[PDB]
Amino acid sequence: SMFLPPPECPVFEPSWEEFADPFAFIHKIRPIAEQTGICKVRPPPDWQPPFACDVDKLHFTPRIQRLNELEAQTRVKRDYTLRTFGEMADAFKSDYFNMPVHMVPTELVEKEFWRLVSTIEEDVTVEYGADIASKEFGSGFPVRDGKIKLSPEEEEYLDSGWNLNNMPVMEQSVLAHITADICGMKLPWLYVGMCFSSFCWHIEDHWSYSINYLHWGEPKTWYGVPGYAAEQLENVMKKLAPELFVSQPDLLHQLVTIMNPNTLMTHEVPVYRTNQCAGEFVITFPRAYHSGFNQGFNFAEAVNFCTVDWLPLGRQCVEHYRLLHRYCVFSHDEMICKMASKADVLDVVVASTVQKDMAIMIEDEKALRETVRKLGVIDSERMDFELLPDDERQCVKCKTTCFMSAISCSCKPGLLVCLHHVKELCSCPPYKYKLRYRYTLDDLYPMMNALKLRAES
Ligand SMILES: O=C(CSc1nc(-c2ccccc2)cc(=O)[nH]1)NO
Ligand SMILES: O=C(CSc1nc(-c2ccccc2)cc(=O)[nH]1)NO
Ligand SMILES: [Cl-]
Ligand SMILES: [Mn+2]
Ligand SMILES: [Zn+2]
Ligand SMILES: [Zn+2]
Numbered sequence: 001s002m003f004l005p006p007p008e009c010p011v012f013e014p015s016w017e018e019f020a021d022p023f024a025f026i027h028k029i030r031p032i033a034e035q036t037g038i039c040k041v042r043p044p045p046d047w048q049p050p051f052a053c054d055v056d057k058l059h060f061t062p063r064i065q066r067l068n069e070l071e072a073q074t075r076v077k078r079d080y081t082l083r084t085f086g087e088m089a090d091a092f093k094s095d096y097f098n099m100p101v102h103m104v105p106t107e108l109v110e111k112e113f114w115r116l117v118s119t120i121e122e123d124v125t126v127e128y129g130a131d132i133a134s135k136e137f138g139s140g141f142p143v144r145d146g147k148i149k150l151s152p153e154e155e156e157y158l159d160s161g162w163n164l165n166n167m168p169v170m171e172q173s174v175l176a177h178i179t180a181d182i183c184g185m186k187l188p189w190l191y192v193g194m195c196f197s198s199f200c201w202h203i204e205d206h207w208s209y210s211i212n213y214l215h216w217g218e219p220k221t222w223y224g225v226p227g228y229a230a231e232q233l234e235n236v237m238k239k240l241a242p243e244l245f246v247s248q249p250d251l252l253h254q255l256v257t258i259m260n261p262n263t264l265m266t267h268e269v270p271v272y273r274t275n276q277c278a279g280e281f282v283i284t285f286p287r288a289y290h291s292g293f294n295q296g297f298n299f300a301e302a303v304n305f306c307t308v309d310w311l312p313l314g315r316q317c318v319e320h321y322r323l324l325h326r327y328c329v330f331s332h333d334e335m336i337c338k339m340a341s342k343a344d345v346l347d348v349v350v351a352s353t354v355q356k357d358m359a360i361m362i363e364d365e366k367a368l369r370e371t372v373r374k375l376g377v378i379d380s381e382r383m384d385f386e387l388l389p390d391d392e393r394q395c396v397k398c399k400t401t402c403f404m405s406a407i408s409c410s411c412k413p414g415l416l417v418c419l420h421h422v423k424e425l426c427s428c429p430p431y432k433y434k435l436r437y438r439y440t441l442d443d444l445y446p447m448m449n450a451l452k453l454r455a456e457s
Contacts, residue, residue: 002111002114002115003110003111003114003115003260003262004262004265005107005110005273006223006261006265006271006272006273007272007273008272008273008274009033009036009037009038009039009040009222009224009272009273009274010029010032010033010036010039010040011039011040011041011042011274012025012029012039012040012041012042013041013042013044014041014043014044015044016044016046016047019043019044019047019162020161021161022161022162022167022170022211023161023170023172023173023307025041026209026283026307027307027309030285030309033283033285034226034227034285034288035226035228036224036226036270036272037224037225037226037227037229037272037284037285037288037289037290038222038224038272038274038282038283038284038285038288038290039282039283040274040276040280040281040282040283041280041281041282041283042279042280042281043162043279043280043281047160047162048279049140049141049142049157049160049163049215050142050151050153050154050157051140051215051216052154053082053140055081055082055083055086056081056082056083057081058081058082058136058137059079059080059081059082059136059137060079060080060082060085060129060131060136060137060192061078061079061129062078062079062080062085062127062128062129063077063127063128063129063130064125064126064127065125065126065127065128065197065198066123066124066125067113067116067117067122067124067125067126067196067198067258068117068120068258069117069118069257069258069259069260070240070241070257070258070259071257071258072243072244072255072256072257073200073255073256073257073258074252074253074254074255074256075200075202075252075254075256076252080127080129082192085127085129085192085194085297086297088127088194089194089195089296089297090296090297092126092194092195093194093195093296093297096195101195101218101296101297102218102296104295104296106219106221106275106295109195109196109221109295109296110221113196113198113221113293114260114262116196117198117258117260118260124196126194126195126196126197126198127194127197128191128192128193128194128197128294129190129191129192130189130190130191130192131189131190132183132184132187132188132189132190133187133188133190137190139164139165139188139190139301140190140213140215140299140301141157141160141163141164141165141188141213141301142154142155142157142158142163143158143165144158162211162213162281164188164211164213164301164302164303165188165303167211167303167305168185168186168187168303168304168305168306169186171347171350172307172308172347172349172350173305173306173307174306174307174308174310174311174335174339174350174353174354175306175335177338177339177342177345177346178330178335178338178339179338180330180331180334180335180338180386181330181390182329182330184205184304184329185205185206185208185304185306185329185330186303186304187303188301188302188303189301189302189303190299190300190301191299191300191301191302192298192299193217193220193294193296193297193298193299193300194294194296194297194298195218195294195295195296195297196293196294197293197294198258198291198292198293198294199290199291199292199293200256200257200258200291201233201237201256201257201258201259201289201290201291202256202289202290202291203230203287203288203289203290204284204286204304205304205329206304206306206314206317206318206328206329206330206332207227207286207287207310207313207314207316207317208286208304208305208306208310208314209283209284209285209286209304209305209306209307209310210283210284210302210303210304210305211281211282211283211302211303211305212276212281212282212283212284212300212301212302213280213281213300213301213302214276214277214278214279214280214282214298214299214300215278215299215300215301216278216298216299217278217296217297217298217299218294218295218296218297218298219275219276219277219278219294219295219298220275220276220282220292220293220294220295220298220300221273221274221275221276221292221293221294221295222273222274222275222276222282222290222291222292223261223271223272223273223290223291223292224271224272224273224274224284224288224289224290225264225269225270225271225272225288225289225290226270226285226288227285227286227287227288229269229270229289230287230288230289232267232268232269233264233269233289236263236264236267236269237257237259240259240263241257241259243255244256244257247325248326250327251326251327251328251329254326258291259291261273261291275295278298286309286310286313287313287317308349308350308352308353308354311353311354311356311357312356312357314332315332315357315360315361317332318332318400321399321400322395322398322400322418322420323398325397325398325399326399327394327399327401328399328400328401330390330401331385331401331402331403333361333403333404334385334386334401334403336354336357336358336361337358337403337404337438337439337447339351339354339451340354340358340447340448340450340451341447343447343450343451343453343454344450344454346451346454348454348455348457349455351451351452351454351455352451352455354451355448355451355452355455358444358447358448358451359448361404362441362444362445362448365404365405365441365444366441368405368419368420369405369419369435369437369441371419372407372419372422372435373435375422375423375430376429376430376431376433377407377422377430377431377433377434377435378431379431379433379434379435380434380435380436380437381434381435381436381437382436382437382438382440383406383436383437383438384438385402385403385406385436385438386403386438392414393406393416394416395416395417395418395420395421396415396416396417396421396424396425397417397418397420397421397424398418398420398421400418402416402418403438404437404438404439405418405419405435405436405437405438406418406419406435406436407419407422407425407433407434407435407436408425408433408434408436409425409426409428409432409433409434410432411426411428411432412425412426416436
């Protein structure tokens with residue numbers, strides 16, 4: 001009546017045989033999980049990564065959070081040790097409820113969360129940790145490094161397919177051979193939670209998957225929306241919180257918010273829930289919106305994840321970013337061309353899928369180049385876009401990261417537009433412009449052919 005819990009998302013309990021290969025497993029469950037946006041995976045009783053840390057030596061700078069529904073927040077930004085954070089967090093929860101922390105029912109914390117965020121009178125603030133691994137606070141999974149002898153148990157999980165440090169560099173990940181600067185998306189993030197600390201509604205950068213593991217502690221409660229309903233959710237957000245939709249200055253500056261899932265469900269957005277317990281994975285699918293909050297003191301690790309299934313969606317995402325004038329994290333076309341340049345060592349299923357995306361890329365590029373030639377741009381020169389800092393190769397109009405080609409004018413030194421925005425660079429006549437291109441079409445067809453040969457093996 002006050003809060004009606006969404007239906008439970010799918011929960012999978014794979015055998016060791018089914019579990020061992022994450023890419024195969026996710027591909028298998030996709031017909032089901034893509035309809036719910038999120039799903040939970042319980043590893044075989046077998047699989048038990050060791051979790052060891054000195055809570056007095058781990059330390060981090062906490063972020064602070066007000067809990068008001070529809071209030072604007074941002075995803076990116078005092079010091080706690082893991083022990084002193086834990087002490088603060090446990091005391092907060094047990095004081096809030098006047099109960100021992102584990103005797104508080106998960107259903108109650110959930111009901112209470114949605115009450116407190118909806119109430120103007122309440123001004124509850126909480127703290128949390130969120131960062132990539134560092135020397136001050138490393139991964140929860142085993143990683144290789146000298147000077148430290150690992151135990152046989154730790155050694156066992158160094159090369160696990162579900163060790164999140166590994167997933168982005170495995171052979172069926174399309175980011176594996178990517179050498180570009182995208183620290184954000186190949187490195188796991190670490191999240192230290194406390195009761196009610198919350199992650200607002202969002203999808204992943206470039207519509208990637210995310211894989212999320214709860215190492216230890218009280219559960220993390222999730223809400224998820226399938227990819228096919230992303231635009232309906234956004235329309236609801238626009239109607240109820242239009243303040244979130246003003247133009248952001250940077251990539252690091254887009255706005256997100258807390259919103260009751262019942263509100264979404266009332267507006268015909270399908271929503272699913274789950275409580276993720278210690279030792280369980282949650283997987284979010286491409287363009288699947290999700291949000292949630294922590295039941296209490298806990299420690300989670302998450303990583304973006306890009307598969308062959310994701311490739312066409314990645315291209316659509318960048319297109320969508322362009323229409324919104326939103327910054328990219330990386331160049332999709334650069335990733336594709338990098339993989340083509342390494343066709344001889346690519347996984348063959350990867351090669352096959354990349355070949356298909358590349359064919360779409362080349363036909364789109366060919367049409368765009370014909371169009372800008374008809375606008376009177378005649379001069380051209382090869383340009384190694386990958387050498388430019390990312391903030392030095394965005395289209396001045398739509399902020400897309402250029403790689404295949406761009407237009408420049410010596411009138412505006414250093415400025416670029418993508419080929420969709422030739423008319424947005426300056427007032428000079430087009431014959432003063434140069435087409436800057438990474439590859440000729442003659443360079444591109446043999447690259448695509450290499451992929452095709454590799455895929456035929
Ligand atoms: O949680 C599960 C996983 S297998 C499975 N789940 C579902 C499902 C579970 C929750 C929400 C929607 C679908 C549909 C189906 O055909 N199969 N079953 O109870
Ligand atoms: O969305 C996720 C991470 S869940 C999570 N995220 C956060 C978080 C993420 C970004 C910025 C701040 C917090 C905190 C937390 O306790 N949990 N994976 O797809
Ligand atoms: Cl509040
Ligand atoms: Mn996420
Ligand atoms: Zn543009
Ligand atoms: Zn000019």
